[PDB]
């Protein structure tokens, strides 16, 4: 509350560390469905169904231009990529499996780096 603060957690390395995570996600062999924005002209249903499209290149540009206020808003966009993927893709598809794999990979790096 006013003039009453928990001890200051060191956040000065968060930008660097999110960038490293994102690099690891970008270079994973199962990243291919997520590297670029879904082409809304060429994929029927995507535009109407997925209210907030997100992809790794869009997260990279937001990261690089100071558009994440803190590490939690970064994690929310990463999770959005995988939540979108589950909305649009069957679990038993190459893309559906890719999204589960990447979500797992992300959540471990997130825990190991920050928790």
UniProtKB/Swiss-Prot annotation:
Subunit structure and binding partners: Component of the BRF-1 ISWI chromatin remodeling complex, at least composed of SMARCA1 and BAZ2B, which regulates the spacing of histone octamers on the DNA template to facilitate access to DNA. Within the BRF-1 ISWI chromatin remodeling complex interacts with SMARCA1; the interaction is direct. Component of the BRF-5 ISWI chromatin remodeling complex, at least composed of SMARCA5/SNF2H and BAZ2B, which regulates the spacing of histone octamers on the DNA template to facilitate access to DNA.
Function: Regulatory subunit of the ATP-dependent BRF-1 and BRF-5 ISWI chromatin remodeling complexes, which form ordered nucleosome arrays on chromatin and facilitate access to DNA during DNA-templated processes such as DNA replication, transcription, and repair. Both complexes regulate the spacing of nucleosomes along the chromatin and have the ability to slide mononucleosomes to the center of a DNA template. The BRF-1 ISWI chromatin remodeling complex has a lower ATP hydrolysis rate than the BRF-5 ISWI chromatin remodeling complex.
Residues of the Bromo domain: 9-113
Annotated transmembrane regions: none
UniProt-annotated location(s): Nucleus
Organism of derivation: Homo sapiens
Family affiliation: Belongs to the WAL family.
Expression sites by tissue: Expressed at varying levels in several tissues, whereas a smaller transcript was expressed specifically in testis.
Gene expressing this chain: BAZ2B
Whole-protein coverage range: 2054 to 2166 of 2168
The name this protein goes by in its record: Bromodomain adjacent to zinc finger domain protein 2B
